[PDB]
Design a protein around this motif. Structure first.
Motif, mmCIF file in Angstrom:
data_model
loop_
_atom_site.group_PDB
_atom_site.id
_atom_site.type_symbol
_atom_site.label_atom_id
_atom_site.label_comp_id
_atom_site.label_asym_id
_atom_site.label_seq_id
_atom_site.Cartn_x
_atom_site.Cartn_y
_atom_site.Cartn_z
ATOM 1 N N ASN A 99 -31.496 74.123 97.536
ATOM 2 C CA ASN A 99 -31.835 75.463 97.998
ATOM 3 C C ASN A 99 -33.328 75.575 98.299
ATOM 4 O OD1 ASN A 99 -32.982 75.488 95.469
ATOM 5 N ND2 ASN A 99 -31.674 77.110 94.636
ATOM 6 N N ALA A 100 -33.795 76.800 98.547
ATOM 7 C CA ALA A 100 -35.180 76.993 98.965
ATOM 8 C C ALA A 100 -36.160 76.661 97.846
ATOM 9 C CB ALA A 100 -35.386 78.432 99.437
ATOM 10 N N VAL A 101 -35.892 77.145 96.631
ATOM 11 C CA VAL A 101 -36.893 77.077 95.568
ATOM 12 C C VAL A 101 -37.166 75.631 95.171
ATOM 13 C CG1 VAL A 101 -35.180 77.388 93.735
ATOM 14 C CG2 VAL A 101 -37.573 78.005 93.329
ATOM 15 N N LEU A 102 -36.111 74.832 94.997
ATOM 16 C CA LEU A 102 -36.317 73.435 94.622
ATOM 17 C C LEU A 102 -37.053 72.676 95.717
ATOM 18 C CD1 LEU A 102 -32.889 72.636 92.989
ATOM 19 C CD2 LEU A 102 -35.042 73.054 91.815
ATOM 20 N N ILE A 103 -36.728 72.955 96.980
ATOM 21 C CA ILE A 103 -37.437 72.315 98.083
ATOM 22 C C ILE A 103 -38.906 72.716 98.069
ATOM 23 C CG2 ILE A 103 -37.616 72.167 100.584
ATOM 24 C CD1 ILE A 103 -34.488 72.639 100.580
ATOM 25 N N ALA A 104 -39.187 73.998 97.830
ATOM 26 C CA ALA A 104 -40.574 74.450 97.776
ATOM 27 C C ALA A 104 -41.331 73.774 96.640
ATOM 28 C CB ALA A 104 -40.624 75.970 97.623
ATOM 29 N N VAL A 105 -40.723 73.707 95.452
ATOM 30 C CA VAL A 105 -41.352 73.023 94.324
ATOM 31 C C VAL A 105 -41.259 71.511 94.442
ATOM 32 C CG1 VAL A 105 -41.417 72.797 91.813
ATOM 33 C CG2 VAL A 105 -40.795 74.989 92.849
ATOM 34 N N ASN A 106 -40.288 70.998 95.198
ATOM 35 C CA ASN A 106 -40.144 69.562 95.427
ATOM 36 C C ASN A 106 -39.806 68.828 94.130
ATOM 37 O OD1 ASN A 106 -40.028 67.250 96.958
ATOM 38 N ND2 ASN A 106 -42.249 66.979 97.120
ATOM 39 N N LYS A 107 -38.777 69.316 93.439
ATOM 40 C CA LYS A 107 -38.269 68.677 92.235
ATOM 41 C C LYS A 107 -36.748 68.624 92.275
ATOM 42 C CE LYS A 107 -42.019 69.639 88.971
ATOM 43 N NZ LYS A 107 -42.403 70.282 87.686
ATOM 44 N N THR A 108 -36.199 67.526 91.761
ATOM 45 C CA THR A 108 -34.759 67.374 91.672
ATOM 46 C C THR A 108 -34.207 68.346 90.626
ATOM 47 O OG1 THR A 108 -32.984 65.766 91.263
ATOM 48 C CG2 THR A 108 -34.990 65.523 89.962
ATOM 49 N N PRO A 109 -32.939 68.765 90.755
ATOM 50 C CA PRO A 109 -32.428 69.792 89.825
ATOM 51 C C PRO A 109 -32.528 69.400 88.363
ATOM 52 C CG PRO A 109 -30.949 69.542 91.672
ATOM 53 C CD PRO A 109 -31.932 68.426 91.776
ATOM 54 N N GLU A 110 -32.357 68.117 88.041
ATOM 55 C CA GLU A 110 -32.535 67.678 86.661
ATOM 56 C C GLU A 110 -33.945 67.983 86.174
ATOM 57 O OE1 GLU A 110 -31.200 63.900 88.220
ATOM 58 O OE2 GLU A 110 -30.070 63.559 86.372
ATOM 59 N N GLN A 111 -34.947 67.680 87.002
ATOM 60 C CA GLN A 111 -36.331 67.920 86.610
ATOM 61 C C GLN A 111 -36.615 69.408 86.458
ATOM 62 O OE1 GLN A 111 -39.124 64.909 86.587
ATOM 63 N NE2 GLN A 111 -38.921 66.378 84.903
ATOM 64 N N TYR A 112 -36.086 70.236 87.362
ATOM 65 C CA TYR A 112 -36.402 71.661 87.328
ATOM 66 C C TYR A 112 -35.931 72.293 86.024
ATOM 67 C CZ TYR A 112 -36.590 76.570 88.754
ATOM 68 O OH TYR A 112 -36.860 77.918 88.826
ATOM 69 N N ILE A 113 -34.677 72.044 85.644
ATOM 70 C CA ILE A 113 -34.195 72.524 84.352
ATOM 71 C C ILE A 113 -34.975 71.870 83.222
ATOM 72 C CG2 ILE A 113 -32.202 72.702 82.833
ATOM 73 C CD1 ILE A 113 -30.634 72.250 85.702
ATOM 74 N N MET A 114 -35.162 70.551 83.295
ATOM 75 C CA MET A 114 -35.918 69.854 82.261
ATOM 76 C C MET A 114 -37.333 70.400 82.169
ATOM 77 S SD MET A 114 -36.010 67.505 79.881
ATOM 78 C CE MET A 114 -34.416 66.738 80.168
ATOM 79 N N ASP A 115 -37.939 70.706 83.315
ATOM 80 C CA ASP A 115 -39.281 71.274 83.308
ATOM 81 C C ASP A 115 -39.277 72.619 82.590
ATOM 82 O OD1 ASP A 115 -41.841 71.830 85.860
ATOM 83 O OD2 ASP A 115 -41.455 73.020 84.080
ATOM 84 N N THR A 116 -38.266 73.450 82.848
ATOM 85 C CA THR A 116 -38.198 74.755 82.199
ATOM 86 C C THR A 116 -38.029 74.617 80.693
ATOM 87 O OG1 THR A 116 -37.300 75.821 84.175
ATOM 88 C CG2 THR A 116 -36.922 76.906 82.057
ATOM 89 N N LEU A 117 -37.285 73.603 80.250
ATOM 90 C CA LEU A 117 -37.124 73.386 78.817
ATOM 91 C C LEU A 117 -38.458 73.059 78.160
ATOM 92 C CD1 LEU A 117 -33.729 71.521 78.451
ATOM 93 C CD2 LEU A 117 -34.493 73.448 77.057
ATOM 94 N N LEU A 118 -39.295 72.265 78.832
ATOM 95 C CA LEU A 118 -40.586 71.902 78.257
ATOM 96 C C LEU A 118 -41.481 73.121 78.079
ATOM 97 C CD1 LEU A 118 -39.609 68.978 79.214
ATOM 98 C CD2 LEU A 118 -42.049 68.507 79.465
ATOM 99 N N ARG A 119 -41.502 74.022 79.065
ATOM 100 C CA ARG A 119 -42.423 75.153 79.003
ATOM 101 C C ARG A 119 -42.121 76.079 77.832
ATOM 102 N NH1 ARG A 119 -42.492 75.087 85.454
ATOM 103 N NH2 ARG A 119 -44.474 73.955 85.632
ATOM 104 N N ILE A 120 -40.863 76.161 77.403
ATOM 105 C CA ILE A 120 -40.517 77.032 76.285
ATOM 106 C C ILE A 120 -41.175 76.507 75.017
ATOM 107 C CG2 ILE A 120 -38.644 77.965 74.900
ATOM 108 C CD1 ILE A 120 -38.811 79.072 77.783
ATOM 109 N N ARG A 121 -41.951 77.363 74.360
ATOM 110 C CA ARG A 121 -42.600 76.973 73.117
ATOM 111 C C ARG A 121 -41.551 76.667 72.059
ATOM 112 N NH1 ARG A 121 -47.768 76.892 73.787
ATOM 113 N NH2 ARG A 121 -49.008 78.692 74.462
ATOM 114 N N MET A 122 -41.850 75.687 71.203
ATOM 115 C CA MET A 122 -40.872 75.261 70.208
ATOM 116 C C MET A 122 -40.514 76.391 69.253
ATOM 117 S SD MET A 122 -42.472 75.127 67.071
ATOM 118 C CE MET A 122 -41.648 73.860 66.113
ATOM 119 N N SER A 123 -41.492 77.219 68.879
ATOM 120 C CA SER A 123 -41.210 78.327 67.974
ATOM 121 C C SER A 123 -40.224 79.310 68.587
ATOM 122 C CB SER A 123 -42.510 79.039 67.600
ATOM 123 O OG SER A 123 -43.184 79.506 68.755
ATOM 124 N N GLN A 124 -40.258 79.478 69.907
ATOM 125 C CA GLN A 124 -39.294 80.316 70.606
ATOM 126 C C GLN A 124 -38.067 79.548 71.075
ATOM 127 O OE1 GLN A 124 -41.670 81.811 73.834
ATOM 128 N NE2 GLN A 124 -42.682 83.377 72.586
#
Lengths: 206, 125, 51, 229, 94, 62, 103, 125
Positions: free
Chosen positions: B31-56
């Motif tokens: 879709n548009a967003v992944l193409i704009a960010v230029n990341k494969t869907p595995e990375q995009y979800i994986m990237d979002t998991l990293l940003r979440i602080r461990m305490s949260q």
RNA sequence: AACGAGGAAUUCCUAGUAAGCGCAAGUCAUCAGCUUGCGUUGAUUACGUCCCUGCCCUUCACAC
């Protein structure tokens, strides 16, 4: 098989009326209504409409505001009496509320032969709104059982109070009509109409 | 703004939407967003998991309904084929995967889905 | 349904004083009020002067 | 062979007020009425009489027209339904002051006199009969919801909403209930004044309608629907 | 607990006294023949009796109710109750 | 018909509107199935709620 | 208007019913069933009210072409109700059925 | 000497002093029979102990209660607490302890205020 | 003539609390156009949330 625990007839030098002895046999509200046969029809309201502990009079002087959910353990009749006294002029007068509830239960037994406590519990079960709205416009949310019990008692008391504010009827009689109608499930009760309106507006914004 | 968990749910909907799309596309061929960010869907979800602080993180995971947990499991299964991603973030996947299973274990086992049984078997080994 | 007409004073002013049917009753009320206003002011000035 | 009523003398219908909440009724809420007072003596602010003052106040003069609110009050109170004691009028001023209109009232016809009453009402909080036997116009406490009948259908007038037959809508609606119509006496603007209260919005005609004509059109349909004649 | 004493009569009645004050508290009447044994478990909950008529009654001492009744073929002569394992032996007439 | 659902967990740090609590409820009819709902009143675990509609999933209410 | 009072308590008024605009000469409680009240009026309809529901009659018996001033409940037959009018006819009704037409 | 015990019940400023002695079931409050206690609406409140344990226990004792201070309600609660405490004390002193335990169990099962004073001491928060 | 519980806005309040009822005292400042004590009757609703609005703080093992 028989087990006998009394071998001498009990006569007390201080005379005690026979009704008090038949009360010795079993605890009954005002020594006239038994708690044995009362049951909350709706399963959810159970554990929040407390009728298991029989009491002689609604006055208990208990501590129910200390912790968050102690109000559940409080007997339902005593909560109804408490909700009956409002609007300032009646603040602090619990004995009058107890008298009003006594008269109202007598009226309910009169008009309908059913156990009055059963009618009270049926009304409290029926007038509890099961789905409500919250301001965001509105959006629909579910309602906790304690809030249902509280709002049911409040709606019944306020409807009965308003119906007889400037009418020949007395609080006891209008409250009896309100409770009977609510237990029946009829629209005629103020509480049932308010509950239906709340659920309908919630359904609209669901 | 969106909070932890709510962000993760949004990411799962996007990434797994494409993972379902390509697999159906490949299955049919055989879709548009992944193409704009230029990341494969595995990375995009994986990237979002990293940003979440461990305490949260743990509080974020509990908020998800079950229907996203099935989505979460397929995401982990998809990551498995990418050995590079797996060994990069191996501790993070393991901690999150076990917490999901432990929290709603009762509801997981009840399901009779044969495909789900195969996915966990692959995710296991 | 029965019909009535509203009662009102044309060119009403709330700051203005309610019209009174009796002139003597109105006039004394004017005089009494001047006494209370004048009495309160005089006492206030005397107290400040004494202090 | 049903026997007749014992007494056939014509009997005046009851006056219907906020206190009575069970009886069937048709309620009109003239939303966003433009009724405000200010010193020059106090005067009801008017769109054409007071342009200089209202520019100083900063509110736009286009929405300063009580004549619409007067106009709707006139047509509603002279409709046969009010003469049948089945109508009660509520007014919501733009500022948020809520006015109860007793059905008995007979507002003066000329717009000049009507402005005389409003300033007294907004300042004295109540208006009394010439014979001093009930209060005709009384201010009351928001929100409008509590004073409305307990079981009541709420609707608004939206030009964009689907067109309906007012007669058809009333008959399909239940009996023990009552109906409220929220009409915009405002000249022009978005139809969201009563969206917080109402549940759904309707239009009476494909064609645009003034506030007065819309109220007259709707009330008449109830008269045919309820056999008011 | 050492608070109660059970007396079995030859006429089939079981009387329960209190040892501290020697005041009668309860009387049980099931057997019609002589009661030849009485015992109460360690928990002071379930009570068991036997009589020459051959019936073994099971009682709930707390609630004063008849849990059940068992009939044996022959009269019962004696009883020994083992509190640790909740087994009691009955010396039957046969 | 109305379903009954027992609360099993009162979710925290959900960012819901004041006075509204997000909860996870398992149906009495089927203990396995679970659904996340919004509750308006005081709510604690092991209490039962009457769900009019069993399909909608809760969303953050701001 | 038909009113029900607590016997020996004149002050209290339990239930008040506006049975009809015409005079209501007869108001008799049903002997078998307590909760139901029958009222006969000069309107020539012997409505059978219920104490719990006072707004509408449970049943309305008709068919009397003149004043009904006599009402009786037959013992052992709770469904049956008998009314006699100045027409010279004694009408019997079956409340268990739909009614409003004498058996 | 005649066996006798004394107990106190307190509710707000209302204080009741109960003497329980061996007797013939003569219960009195302020020199009058217990049946005449007022207000009548709360009379059963004072009856609550007598009915919970059964009149047979009282048939062998005389109870004399003197009440002072407080209002109607506080006096009623003082009377009931005094009667319960006095009965339990008498059963302790001059009867078996098993009956004492049964009485305490019944009273605490119904309403512990019958034995423990209800003191609504202020708590700053 | 005025009035039938008081509009908009705004303020306060979580248990022997809100509210109602009376009885005393007048304690070197204040108070009688009243102040302070004393007892009596005594509730509803929350006791969660940082979503909004403000204020504030941070950037010696094992496990993290």
């Amino acid at each position: 098989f028989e087990v006998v625990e009394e071998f001498t007839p009990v006569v007390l030098a201080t005379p005690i009326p026979e009704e008090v002895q038949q009360a010795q046999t079993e605890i009954k509200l005002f020594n006239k209504w038994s708690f044995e046969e009362v049951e909350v029809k709706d399963a959810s309201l159970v554990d929040y409409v407390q009728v298991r502990q029989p009491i002689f009079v609604a006055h208990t002087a208990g501590r129910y505001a200390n912790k968050r959910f102690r109000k559940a353990q409080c007997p339902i009749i005593e909560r109804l009496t408490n909700s009956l006294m409002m609007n300032g002029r009646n603040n602090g007068k619990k004995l009058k509320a107890v008298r009003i509830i006594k008269h109202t239960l007598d009226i309910i037994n009169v008009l309908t032969d059913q156990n009055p406590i059963q009618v009270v519990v049926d009304a409290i079960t029926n007038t509890g709104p099961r789905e409500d709205t919250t301001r965001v416009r509105r959006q629909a949310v579910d309602v906790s059982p304690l809030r249902r019990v509280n709002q049911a008692i409040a709606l019944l008391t306020i409807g009965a109070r308003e119906a007889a504010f400037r009418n020949i009827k007395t609080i006891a009689e209008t409250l009896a009509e309100e409770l009977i109608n609510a237990a029946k499930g009829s629209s005629t009760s103020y509480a049932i109409k308010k509950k239906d309106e709340l659920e309908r507006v919630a359904k609209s914004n669901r | 703004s969106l909070k932890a968990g709510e962000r993760l749910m949004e990411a799962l909907d996007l990434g797994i939407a494409e993972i379902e799309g390509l697999e159906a596309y490949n299955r049919d061929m055989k879709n548009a967003v992944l193409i704009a960010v230029n990341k494969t869907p595995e990375q995009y979800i994986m990237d979002t998991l990293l940003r979440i602080r461990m305490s949260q993180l743990e509080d974020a995971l509990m908020v998800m309904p079950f229907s996203y947990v099935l989505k979460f499991l397929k995401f982990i299964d998809t990551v498995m084929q990418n050995k590079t991603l797996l060994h990069s973030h191996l501790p993070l996947i393991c901690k999150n995967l076990f917490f999901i299973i432990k929290f709603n274990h009762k509801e997981l086992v009840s399901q009779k889905n044969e495909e789900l049984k195969l996915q966990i078997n692959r995710v296991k080994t | 349904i029965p019909t009535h007409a509203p009662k009102y004073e044309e060119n009403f002013n709330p700051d203005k004083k309610s019209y009174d049917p009796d002139r003597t009753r109105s006039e004394i009320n004017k005089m009494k009020a001047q006494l209370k206003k004048e009495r309160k002011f005089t006492m206030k000035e005397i107290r400040k002067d004494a202090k | 062979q049903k026997a007749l009523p014992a007494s056939l003398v014509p009997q005046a219908p009851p006056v219907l007020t906020s206190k009575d909440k069970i009886t069937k009724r048709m309620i009109v809420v003239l939303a966003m009425a433009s009724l405000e007072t200010h010193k020059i003596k106090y005067v009801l602010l008017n769109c054409d009489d007071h342009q200089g003052l209202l520019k100083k106040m900063g509110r736009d003069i286009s929405e300063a027209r009580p004549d619409i609110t007067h106009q709707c009050l006139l047509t509603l109170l002279d409709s046969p339904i009010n003469k049948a004691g089945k109508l009660q009028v509520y007014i919501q001023t733009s500022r948020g002051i809520l006015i109860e209109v007793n059905p008995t009232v007979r507002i003066p016809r000329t717009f000049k006199r009507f402005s005389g009453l409003m300033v007294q009402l907004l300042h004295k909080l109540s208006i009394r009969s010439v014979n001093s036997e009930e209060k005709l116009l009384k201010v009351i406490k928001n929100p409008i919801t509590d004073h409305l009948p307990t079981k009541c259908r709420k609707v608004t007038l939206s030009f964009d909403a689907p067109v309906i037959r007012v007669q058809d809508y009333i008959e399909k609606l239940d009996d023990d209930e009552s109906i409220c119509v929220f009409v915009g006496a405002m000249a022009r603007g978005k139809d969201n004044f009563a969206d917080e209260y109402v549940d759904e919005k309707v239009g009476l005609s494909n064609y645009p309608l003034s506030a007065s004509v819309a109220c007259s059109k709707f009330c008449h349909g109830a008269e045919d629907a309820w056999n008011i004649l | 607990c050492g608070n109660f004493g059970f007396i079995g009569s030859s006429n089939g009645s079981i009387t329960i006294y209190n040892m501290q004050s020697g005041i009668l508290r309860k009387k049980y009447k099931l057997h019609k023949r002589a009661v030849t044994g009485i015992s109460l478990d360690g928990m002071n909950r379930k009570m068991v009796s036997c009589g020459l008529d051959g019936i073994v009654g099971f009682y709930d001492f707390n609630k004063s109710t008849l849990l059940g009744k068992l009939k044996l073929d022959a009269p019962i002569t004696a009883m020994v109750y083992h509190r640790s394992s909740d087994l009691f032996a009955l010396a039957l007439d046969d | 018909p109305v379903t009954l659902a027992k609360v099993i967990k009162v979710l925290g740090r959900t960012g819901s509107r004041g006075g509204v609590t997000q909860v996870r409820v398992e149906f009495l009819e089927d203990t396995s199935r679970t659904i996340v709902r919004n509750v308006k009143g005081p709510v604690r675990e092991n209490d039962i709620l009457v769900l009019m509609e069993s399909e909608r999933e809760a969303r953050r209410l701001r | 208007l038909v009113s029900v009072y607590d016997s020996y308590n004149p002050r209290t008024i339990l239930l008040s019913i506006n049975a009809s605009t015409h005079p209501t000469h007869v108001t008799k409680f049903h002997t078998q069933d307590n909760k139901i009240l029958a009222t006969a009026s000069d309107d020539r309809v012997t409505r059978l009210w219920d104490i719990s529901n006072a707004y509408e009659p449970q049943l309305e018996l008709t068919g009397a072409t003149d004043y009904v001033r006599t009402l009786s409940f037959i013992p052992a037959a709770p469904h049956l109700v008998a009314t006699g009018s100045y027409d010279g006819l004694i009408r019997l009704y079956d409340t268990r059925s739909s009614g409003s037409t004498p058996i | 000497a005649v066996p006798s015990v004394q107990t106190f019940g307190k509710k707000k400023s209302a204080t009741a002093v109960a003497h329980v002695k061996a007797g013939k079931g003569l219960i009195k409050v302020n020199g009058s029979p217990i049946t005449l206690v007022e207000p009548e609406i709360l009379r059963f409140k004072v009856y609550e102990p007598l009915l919970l344990v059964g009149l047979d226990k009282f048939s062998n004792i005389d109870i004399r209660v003197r009440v002072t201070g407080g209002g109607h309600v506080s006096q009623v609660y003082a009377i009931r607490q005094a009667i319960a405490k006095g009965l339990v004390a008498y059963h302790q002193k001059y009867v078996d302890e098993q009956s004492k335990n049964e009485l305490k169990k019944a009273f605490t099962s119904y309403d512990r205020t019958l034995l423990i004073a209800d003191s609504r001491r202020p708590e700053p928060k």
